Design a protein around this ligand. Structure first.
Ligand SMILES: *[C@@H]1O[C@H](CO)[C@@H](O)[C@H](O)[C@H]1NC(C)=O
Ligand SMILES: [Ca+2]
Length: 476
């Protein structure tokens, strides 16, 4: 699917090892500290597609599918997929080629997309340096395909970031020489054939900043689908230029101030408001970025705060921001693991309850986003507009005039006081009825055009014209 096709999507990101077992167990042990395969599979995902689609997601992002180093390293198994050795074999832990095709086909039947994580930067090896037997790498079965062995020490030196190795002396990530025509041609052939064999709709590309920029346009073109890059940097002047060589990037610039704004009652709405405006102006296309506050490379939101109101507000932001919302499996069950490996919790140990507070919030937020998009072809290209901030509040507007969603978020938290916020700039007409679609209340626009937004419980408020909800199953 094209970048334009992907703009309206909403992604559920999962670890194949950690989401769903073939046996469907909700009690199979998964001690994250063990860092071992816990037994999630592609068939497991198929069996739980109702759970995911119930939250109004239109797509899933799964972790890489290639065959990994075999060892239980001192850092555990390659359960995560990022330590590949044979790119022409699947990881048999997750199932067969027919299973991965079955998952693509199951998603397609339900009108959903498959996004697959891919690594071009590196292979993985249990050991480092003179220990590496380059013959185990397929097809890059020679030291000649790799950058000379060195570790990245100066992250300020972009040449060392691209040409030196990730990992360490325990588990090294041998760095492919992506400046070599044979390596480019092999990767370009591989990714085009992966996408076509498995009918993949889009790719999440790992470790994009570790590969020189001139590699990526040919990779994106050979894939033939939307590619979203992991450029792990919060500075938009570093990250947003990667959009000149790849369709999209993960919104790490928004991540840091978004997390800060909602993880505590003293969070900066100013820093988030300012970053929305910087990304909107200075990123090639903010509507092709992926918005997130949780992933497998940072502490989960609930590790910072267990306040459920704060988690509801940050989730609503992710769904209603410019670009493609991305929710990490477990976020909807308020998982509170810290850094790797604590944030790789098995989704099945929740029991997959569809009545959890954050399952319901995400379902309501995706419901209005999916509905508004079905009625307003301009929604996904209207750049999100922050119209208000104070110490504890940010309000934003998105969508075509007369159909706009106006969202009011708060970091007051669950003990927040009840009060009316008189909101200017929402762009609705005096006497217009608006539905607050999270709580299903009516708000009427005042004679002066200001919206008397009821605030309470620190809850997020998502407004949409009542008369535009005719025939929708929202708040009925
Ligand atoms: C796709 O399948 C073909 C067999 O037709 C094979 O030539 C190619 O290596 C496969 N590519 C991937 C990534 O599976
Ligand atoms: Ca590299």
């Amino acid at each position: 699917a094209t970048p334009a096709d992907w703009r309206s999507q909403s992604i559920y990101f999962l670890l194949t090892d950690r989401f769903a077992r073939t046996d469907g167990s909700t009690t199979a042990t998964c001690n994250t500290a063990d860092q071992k395969y816990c037994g999630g599979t592609w068939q497991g995902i198929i069996d739980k597609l109702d759970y995911i689609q119930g939250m109004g997601f239109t797509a899933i992002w799964i972790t890489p599918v290639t065959a990994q180093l075999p060892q239980t390293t001192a850092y555990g198994d390659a359960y995560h997929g990022y330590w590949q050795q044979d790119i022409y074999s699947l990881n048999e832990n997750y199932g067969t080629a027919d299973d991965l095709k079955a998952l693509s086909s199951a998603l397609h039947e339900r009108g959903m997309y498959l996004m697959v994580d891919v690594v071009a930067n590196h292979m993985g090896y249990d050991g480092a340096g003179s220990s590496v037997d380059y013959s185990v790498f397929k097809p890059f079965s020679s030291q000649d395909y790799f950058h000379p062995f060195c570790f990245i020490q100066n992250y300020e030196d972009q040449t060392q970031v691209e040409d030196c190795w990730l990992g360490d002396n325990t588990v090294s990530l041998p760095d492919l020489d992506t400046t070599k025509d044979v390596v480019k041609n092999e990767w370009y052939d591989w990714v085009g054939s992966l996408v076509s064999n498995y009918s993949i709709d889009g790719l999440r590309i790992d470790t994009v900043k570790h590969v020189q920029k001139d590699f990526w346009p040919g990779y994106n073109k050979a894939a033939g689908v939307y590619c979203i890059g992991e450029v792990l940097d919060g500075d938009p002047a570093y990250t947003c230029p990667y959009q000149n060589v790849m369709d999209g990037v993960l919104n790490y610039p928004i991540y840091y101030p978004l997390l800060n704004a909602f993880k505590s009652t003293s969070g900066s709405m100013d820093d988030l408001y300012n970053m929305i405006n910087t990304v909107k102006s200075d990123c090639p296309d903010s509507t092709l970025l992926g918005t997130f506050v949780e992933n497998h490379d940072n502490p989960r939101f609930a590790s910072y705060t267990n306040d459920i109101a704060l988690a509801k507000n940050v989730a609503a932001f992710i769904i209603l921001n410019d670009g493609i919302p991305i929710i990490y499996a477990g976020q909807e069950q308020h998982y509170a693991g810290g850094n790797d490996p604590a944030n790789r919790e098995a989704t099945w140990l929740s029991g997959y309850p569809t009545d959890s507070e954050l399952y319901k919030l995400i379902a309501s937020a995706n419901a209005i986003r999916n509905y508004a998009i079905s009625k307003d072809t301009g929604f996904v290209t209207y750049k999100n507009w922050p119209i208000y901030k104070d110490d504890t509040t940010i309000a934003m507007r998105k969508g075509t005039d007369g159909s706009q969603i106006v969202t009011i978020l708060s970091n007051k938290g669950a003990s927040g006081d009840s009060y009316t916020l008189s909101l200017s700039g929402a762009g609705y007409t005096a006497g217009q009825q608006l539905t607050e679609v999270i709580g299903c209340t009516t708000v009427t626009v005042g004679s002066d055009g200001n919206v008397p937004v009821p605030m309470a419980g620190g809850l997020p408020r998502v407004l949409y014209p009542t008369e535009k909800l005719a025939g929708s199953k929202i708040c009925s």
